A = this chain, B = another copy of it.
Amino acid sequence: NYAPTPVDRFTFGLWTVGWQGRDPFGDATRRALDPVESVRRLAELGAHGVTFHDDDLIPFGSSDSEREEHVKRFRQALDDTGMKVPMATTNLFTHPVFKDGGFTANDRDVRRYALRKTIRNIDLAVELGAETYVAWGGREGAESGGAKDVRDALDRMKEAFDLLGEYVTSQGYDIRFAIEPKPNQPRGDILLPTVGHALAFIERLERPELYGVNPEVGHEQMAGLNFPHGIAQALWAGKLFHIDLNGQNGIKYDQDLRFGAGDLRAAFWLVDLLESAGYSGPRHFDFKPPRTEDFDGVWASAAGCMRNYLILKERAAAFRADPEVQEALRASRLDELARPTAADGLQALLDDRSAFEEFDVDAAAARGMAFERLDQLAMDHLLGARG
């Protein structure tokens, strides 16, 4: 039951199942995986595709001949399995040169190098068929207040993204960008810390239509925010270009638990929203099998990501299709929320005594919302305990 197929568009980063287990306090617990191995194992589990940072696929500093051979082997694995590559990204965070940032490093020479490294990988992403190019500015930020003038940093960040937009336009590429917010870690505070900040920034770019967000479940939860709500705002803005699915237990370091772990009810409401809205992008997992696990546990954890999505999809669909739930949604006036407040216009509203002088505030205040009954129907559907 709940068996994923490529139809479900489940994708995984090479760096997810390939995470060797090094953490702030501990050495690697697993050997490195050949990307070819990961492609073949993920395909066997029913994944649709993979994603990569440049330096996951091509060791940093590789010669041109080494680069070609790494890409050739990877493409053979994709061809052997039918796996796709819908998204790629740049590693602008691991190498020591990026310790103060890539696009917003205080050192101008580093900013220029970061752009050149990204541009090289955009070309590769396009060659592999990627539709989306993600940017996670994990080193953009500060540990201290004097170190980073945030207005100047935002100017540099806009300049960088504008140059990248000029680049893809000039080459006729169809790829679009997706900015991944995170509030902190590895920097004390990261620039563009939430979906909202990233959405706001995009509106100030020269070609805003080329940019959207890549929100990650656990990153919004690291600020204690409601991930489904943030996804709804991204959808409302037309900017949900990609998504990273995982789990997180609240305000901690980024745990990258398998999807469904962490906040299970938020996972339910997320799947309900994505499916109801008709989100058509990849269901991408940015997760880490815990370092306690051997390779059998790696593949079990990856399989669990997909299984949990599919269970939640079933339960959310049953919730929305249940005539008792539909009745409860009307009892709670969800239908009214979707109607305009004043399609009659401002003057009619100003002239409407029912909106002021003749509005019975105490009668309105007496009406219960019936939200608890609705939420218990939702709980019963999630748990398969209807009756």
Contacts and interface: CB of A to CB of B under 8 A. Distances in A.
Given A24-B253, A229-B150, A292-B100, A387 B1 contact: yes
A107 B354 CA distance: 14
Contacts of A350: 116, 119
Interface string A90-102: 0001111111100
B261 A375 contact: yes
A87 interface: no
A147 interface: yes
Contact of A224 (B112, B147, B250): B250
A266 B261 CA distance: 11
Given A291-B99, A359-B113, A384-B384, A373 B297 contact: yes
A349 interface: yes
A346 interface: yes
Given A1-B385, A300-B376, A107 B307 contact: no
Contacts of A385: 1-2, 307, 311, 384
Contacts of A26: 93-96, 98-99, 139, 186
Interface residues of A, number: 169
A99 B349 contact: no
A327 interface: no
A275 interface: no
Interface string A115-154: 1110110000000000000000011001111111111111
A352 B102 CA distance: 17
Interface stretch (A5-13, A35-43, A163-171): A163-171
A255 interface: yes
Given A145-B375, A224-B224, A252-B253, A116 B196 contact: no
Interface stretch (A44-52, A72-80, A278-286, A332-340): A332-340
A112 B339 CA distance: 12
Nearest to A223: B223
Nearest to A228: B145
B332 A106 contact: yes
Interface in A254-297: 254-255, 257-258, 260-261, 263-266, 268-269, 272, 277, 289-297
A250 B253 contact: no
Contact of A367 (B24, B107, B229, B378): B107
Contacts of A151: 232, 235-236, 277
A26 to B, nearest CB: 5
B97 A361 contact: yes
A341 interface: yes
A251 B235 contact: no
Given A163-B349, A226-B189, A253 B184 contact: yes
A276 to B, nearest CB: 9
A160 B341 contact: yes
A291 B269 CA distance: 22
A111 interface: yes
Contacts of A183: 223-225
A342 interface: yes
A189 to B, nearest CB: 4
- Of all A-B residue pairs in the complex, the 8 with the closest CB atoms, nearest first, are A294-B368, A196-B197, A196-B196, A150-B232, A199-B200, A253-B253, A384-B384, A96-B365
23 contacts: A1-B387, A24-B254, A29-B96, A106-B337, A108-B341, A109-B364, A112-B352, A113-B359, A115-B355, A120-B356, A145-B265, A146-B329, A147-B375, A150-B233, A163-B342, A184-B252, A188-B255, A194-B196, A223-B224, A264-B264, A292-B368, A293-B368, A382-B383
